[PDB]
Symmetry: D2
Subunit: 726 residues, 4 copies
């Protein structure tokens, strides 16, 4: 029952490209990657090699293949304590998944600021460019269960736990800069509406159903984040290629006591990139684990996800200077009005060891702040402060969830709290209360001050009556949707129109569709008309005369709201499919791989069967996957080298592979006789931008391909794809 002779069961503990080795727990793949938090988990890491198999009480097991029975065909005996312990632990494996964001993928890394921020905040983790803060990040979808698919259309969660020297700070954000609703009291309404409908629990991972669009049509506050969801923001290529936002306005407090309003941003250093809808939806079927896999593999390859932290900063005296309320989380602050100041860089550089222990049990909370940070009255933030504490007690089984290893602070913690289910800490303090004399009052309160001080809330002025009332300043719902719409490129606008049209086609009750279209007519007539036409709906004269909402503080657009208007492409860590034949021209392949390797782009070698093929020069080429097994959905570009093209010329899967990649706007490159495939994608002989072609794969061919890949997708091909049957 043993390992192969050749040690091929065990992956190399060295960075390797996706597919080259079986993936492995982080501490075994990258044992020399350390930080303070990863080190501190060492008390609970358990190995296995050379150890005897035992019960949980330490008793060695002789026979782990059989129950104890009276004779070998007899009844199982109740005294089999080994069987019952093993079955009981199995029987009790599951815990409640998260009520939202149950589907998520996490990794370890570190953060450091570029320069001390002491002028605007006394937060210790921002005080020194050479003081490094361990982090654990979990990225997530929102709607679906923990076993749902990665590449659904949904908002994404982006939660970062900072293990600072002055306490855990969790920054619990999303990949769009606003939320659907204004006041936390409506959260259960909204989430019930987007989640599977309660009679039949359908659909998973999708807003494309009646109840979501019903709530939307009756709650126009939702429309801004709905625009972002229906755009390609809702289908990121990778967690590495999306933006992050805290959404709410928070405060920074400096040593002088000055408060500055702040909104938090993460910039992906790999650039912004999203799938297209047909590709994203098909990919939930071909690989429901695509984003989880891609994140794990990037870290195993050395393509560490990196993000830049950035702050939009607004002085206290400028609180009311915009035509939107800063405390309204359905409103974004355009970068054109308030730029993002770069603050520091976060690098995710190691995977967990056990997904359940570290990812499933991690607990983040936006209420987890530190001195130098504070809240505001944002009525959605205010309610979140209550919710995460409450849900985690039942999800994680009691109030000692901070003792679960992943959640533990790395800085000191001491207090008079005691007991609770699964209490780990054995307190020796003779006192469990303060004030006490019997322990000289330790642990003691600490006055606030410039560093290492106790937490004190900023003394904000509160004046008003106890009311359940939405601020009048929050009652404007169309101008930000329209700013977003106007800031998208034409192809991005088309994909938005296609998102609304596809989703509303799945709404069974037609008046719900009509009411949503009426809401679109309040944002932009061109958008409303394009959706209406796809739905066979005709706008009335009144609808055509709805006056468009005002510009946002004179802005007619802000290109930072577009994924693509401003190029920010980075090809490192992207992947190319190379479609092999049984007599590959080894000169083509040499040049291809050399150029890819120079830019940090990975390759997957594909064929019509598994095993190996032999190139013209005797080189044996191992096959990663079949054309069916690793579809074009899972790669960024396709390259077909010369060789014996007749081997694959009439293979349906190989032809379809090119048709699918072509449809989904990916760069394709064809060398030598592979150019015969130009017929399948049915498109000229002078060639076309987006298809690289040459007698062979030279320097120039690869440079062209690599340039297209830096632009992510071939948008100019869009008019050509409605004709292809794929």
């Amino acid at each position: 029952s043993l390992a192969p002779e050749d040690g091929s069961h065990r992956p190399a503990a060295e960075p390797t490209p996706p597919g080259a080795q079986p993936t492995a727990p982080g501490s075994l793949k990258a044992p020399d990657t350390r930080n303070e938090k990863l080190n501190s988990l060492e008390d609970v890491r358990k190995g296995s090699e050379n150890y005897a198999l035992t019960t949980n009480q330490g008793v060695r097991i002789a026979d782990d293949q059989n129950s104890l029975r009276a004779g070998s065909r007899g009844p199982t005996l109740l005294e089999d304590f080994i069987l019952r312990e093993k079955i009981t632990h199995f029987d009790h494996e599951r815990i409640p998944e998260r009520i939202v964001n149950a589907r998520g993928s996490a990794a370890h890394g570190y953060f450091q600021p570029y320069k001390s921020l002491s002028d605007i905040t006394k937060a210790d983790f921002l005080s020194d460019p050479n003081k490094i803060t361990p982090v654990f990040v979990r990225f997530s979808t929102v709607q679906g269960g923990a076993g749902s698919a990665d590449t659904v259309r949904d908002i994404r969660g982006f939660a970062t736990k900072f293990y600072t020297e002055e306490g855990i700070f969790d920054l619990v954000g999303n990949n769009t800069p606003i939320f659907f609703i204004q006041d936390a009291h409506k959260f259960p309404d909204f989430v019930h509406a987007v989640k599977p409908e309660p009679h039949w629990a359908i659909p998973q991972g999708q807003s494309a159903h009646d109840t979501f669009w019903d709530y939307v049509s009756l709650q126009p506050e939702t429309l801004h984040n709905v625009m972002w969801a229906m755009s390609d923001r809702g289908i990121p290529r990778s967690y590495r290629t999306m933006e992050g936002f805290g959404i709410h306005t928070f405060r920074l407090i400096n040593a002088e006591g000055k408060a500055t309003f702040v909104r938090f941003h993460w910039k992906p250093l790999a650039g912004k990139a999203s799938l297209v809808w047909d590709e994203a939806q098909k990919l939930t079927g071909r690989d429901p684990d695509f984003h989880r896999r891609e994140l794990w593999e990037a870290i195993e390859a050395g393509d560490f996800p990196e993000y830049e932290l950035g702050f939009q900063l607004i002085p206290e005296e400028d609180e009311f200077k915009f035509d939107f309320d800063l405390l309204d989380p359905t409103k974004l602050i355009p970068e054109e009005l308030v730029p993002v100041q770069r603050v520091g860089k976060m690098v995710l550089n190691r995977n967990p060891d056990n997904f359940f222990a570290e990812n499933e049990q991690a607990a983040f909370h936006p209420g987890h702040i530190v001195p130098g940070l504070d809240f505001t009255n944002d009525p959605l933030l205010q309610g979140r402060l209550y919710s995460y504490t409450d849900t985690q007690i039942s999800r994680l089984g009691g109030p000692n969830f901070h003792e679960i290893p992943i959640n533990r602070p790395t800085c000191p913690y001491h207090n008079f709290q005691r007991d609770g289910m699964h209490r780990m800490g054995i307190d020796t303090n003779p006192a469990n209360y303060e004030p006490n004399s019997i322990n000289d009052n330790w642990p003691r309160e600490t006055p606030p001050g410039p560093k290492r001080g106790g937490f004190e809330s900023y003394q904000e002025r509160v004046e008003g009556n106890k009311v359940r009332e939405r601020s009048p300043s929050f009652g404007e719902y169309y101008s930000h949707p329209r700013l977003f719409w106007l800031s998208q490129t034409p192809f991005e606008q088309r994909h938005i129109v296609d998102g609304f049209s596809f989703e509303l086609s799945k709404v069974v009750r037609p008046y719900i569709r009509e009411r949503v279209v009426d809401q679109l007519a309040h944002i932009d007539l061109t958008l409303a008309q394009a959706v209406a036409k796809n739905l066979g709906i005709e706008l009335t004269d009144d609808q055509l005369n709805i006056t468009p909402p005002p510009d946002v503080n004179g802005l007619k657009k802000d290109p930072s709201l577009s994924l693509y208007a401003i190029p920010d492409g980075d090809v490192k860590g992207r992947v190319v499919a190379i479609l092999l034949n049984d007599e590959v021209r080894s000169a083509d392949l040499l040049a291809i791989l050399k150029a890819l390797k120079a830019k940090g782009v990975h390759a997957k070698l594909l064929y019509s069967r598994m095993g190996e093929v032999t190139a013209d020069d005797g080189t044996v080429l191992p096959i990663a996957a079949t054309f069916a097994g690793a579809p074009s959905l899972t790669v960024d570009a396709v390259i077909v080298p010369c060789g014996n093209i007749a081997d694959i010329a009439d293979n349906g899967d190989a032809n379809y592979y090119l048709m699918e990649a072509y449809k989904h706007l990916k760069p394709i490159a064809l060398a030598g006789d592979a150019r015969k495939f130009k017929a399948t994608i049915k498109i000229a002989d002078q060639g076309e931008e987006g298809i690289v072609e040459a007698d062979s794969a030279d320097g120039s061919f690869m440079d062209e391909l690599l340039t297209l890949m830096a632009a992510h997708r071939v948008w100019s091909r869009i008019p050509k794809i409605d004709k292809i049957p794929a």
Copy 2:
């Protein structure tokens, strides 16, 4: 008055074909379809039309749109007990999913035997062809979570709760007539091998990964059920068009105390029918809820799943 004036928001309370009307809870879609179990659930069914919105304590709510704050732009106050109750119930909605067969779709129905089986079993539910036994049946996949896809390649579970006059009998079977392993002591081994791998929790809903095939290769007792899983049996067209089996040999005991060995079968009266692999895998993407949907809609249409 948010409902459309034409009453088109509400599905007709009569059988209708898939897609013709919005789907609805069973007691509203088919109020006249009754059995003893469904009738006995009446004490806990809760309606809604014409009733005031309240807390769980019965206090009427005036404004379910806003938290209580100090000023309309001020901080939320700890005294907002309406807000806290609503968010707390929300916060605690989830329970652990089933350790296996977490993904499953269920319906109510009824069973009747063709003739009294008193000669071979004193089981009351099988004693009289005029004796009707309410059932609740759940069909499931095995490996994936409750939010995983329906048309994966997997064994299917087929569990029937018989509410008999002498006790609940649960017949907890699968859609193939054998299981992968011999002794329950190995069940955590086998299930761990098929389930997502522990470092990264991949893949969902699939035995197509190293640990499953490592275990199979080292445990040849698995091969028989593996053959079934790799065949089109692993990808049924519908829960209505697959076979059921209790797998184990049980005993029937008659009044004279004679034991007869029995294995249980379910025959789908709609026939046996499966998907093909490329279709099944793509369907997990285009509609991960396809079997759940198909079952619900068949019952709404009057195409009742029948099994012998």
Copy 3:
């Protein structure tokens, strides 16, 4: 600083007698005491001196006196995350108490065998006289809640966790050698019957109610342990002065595979000693924590509880050599037939640091055996094997209770079990199943062998039909109760009579009393008559002629069954009340205290008030307690020295002190004018056995007193106590 200047808040970290210092956490009191288990807990112990007060996330708290509010008389704000974490942890402090034995008191210690027992067992912890095994022992009552009283009449539990090098072994026993019932199936019936009745949840800590005696009257198998319960066995003086028993027959298994039947015994090295009923019951009121307190204070004083482990051993071929069935847990094995062989010694030498974390969360299981031990078919033990695993999952919150620090093995444990609520261990094994090739099949099964081998069950022959049937061999109910009765001294027999009489008086339905009396007439006529008389019941002529049950294998008694038949007193750690007056004769006191100190006997100095008094010669005498504050119930004897006897001669409390102690059969000693107190307890001028008296507290006054204390109580005084109104 709130501590006093003089440092009197902090107990001395050295052995001190009961009452001399405040009690403290074990690791603070006795930092120098260590064993392997205590050392292994070090990583979870938490200090407090010199640390800042923080949240559980490590954020320093500035003001731990106030909620955050809008204005200092304003509403509390939801954003107060410091308040909500502190209150939430508080809100969730409790866990379910144990279904039975909820009330218990526990200490750390160590065990060592006297010699290797490798000839009869391959159990590692018994293999070497040099091998020391850490232990954790919890003693308990059975019926009452965690907050019920110690000195109730009840069975006591005695549970020992041995942290061996081959696994945790739990020896989960009682202070009597049999149980009430035969088959585990009836455990909920019996326990429901003894526990508080379900309508009104009365009575706590008492079998004196209808449902208990109803069950007993209908289930004669219970009578054996009921006899024990009604005897003074039911009210021990201290956990230090009771026997322990595993009750069931288990097996020892040697390296050759030979099985030997075994029953386990603990012998108290401090000897056997019990309270009398009126004393025990009042003491539940004056100090409901008396046993818990006494165990803790003995350990702080260095009076470490010591027990000898012993085995009754029966060869496999002698299974049917007795009049009763070895597998019947309502039968004892008389020591006259099978002697107890001494095995080793256990010393409890350290208190916990945190009662909840170490005591409340400890989980013991009679199914936790190690290779070299095995079970038998005892049908009560059989069912136990199921129950403790089940209960502990809900009590302790999931299947990883073995990771709670007190429960962890000190030896290695590795297996393929994963996940579960509150999972601490982070597994790095690429595999979570076996057989596996991807981790070379580690951790691996180990064949059984002479040492360090895997667990294999003894291949006992099983033959018969699947039946719910009691063995006919178990169907004898009276001969063990009779053996027990005949082995008791006449004063122990009287206290048994009075236990049944008092409990049956509290049974409201008269026919239930009648039915119990009829059961007694089947055991012993003298017993039945005496109880009957106290209940106003007359035996019928038929009851009067019930033939008594036969002797047990020829024995008409066994004095090892009696608490007192064979003197085994030890005065070390017993306590004496010394009743002071305002002008004590200092020569009497020096001699008293010097004599007490030499035998390890503690003293408490008592007066009509707190503070101090001054002896005839200037010596300042500090008062420990008032007569009312520390009643005679709490001491083993009373000495009254000479002095100004007039000062307390008419003190109602001081007179009553002597009356109570007289009634409860405690030695009393009176010196010089303290002899005036003879009048209050009606002692004749020439004195009586059990009252020491003289002109001064010595020559042989202290030897006489200490001699009486060695005999525990003055049994000969029993006829005299009825005429004393106390």
Copy 4:
């Protein structure tokens, strides 16, 4: 929530209101009530927005807090009048 095992402790018989209770809350451990409402959110059109909010009033009205004036700074401070 922890003592009684989940968020449906109001369905424990002794705790239940004797007056009507209807809302959009769903699920939670040991859920007894089986909701037939097509909607589990409001505002909804698919159940005509039932169950519905009720304005506060002299009898049978919805709960509205008394509109007490709050003026002060966010402080963790004991009122001097309590001293």
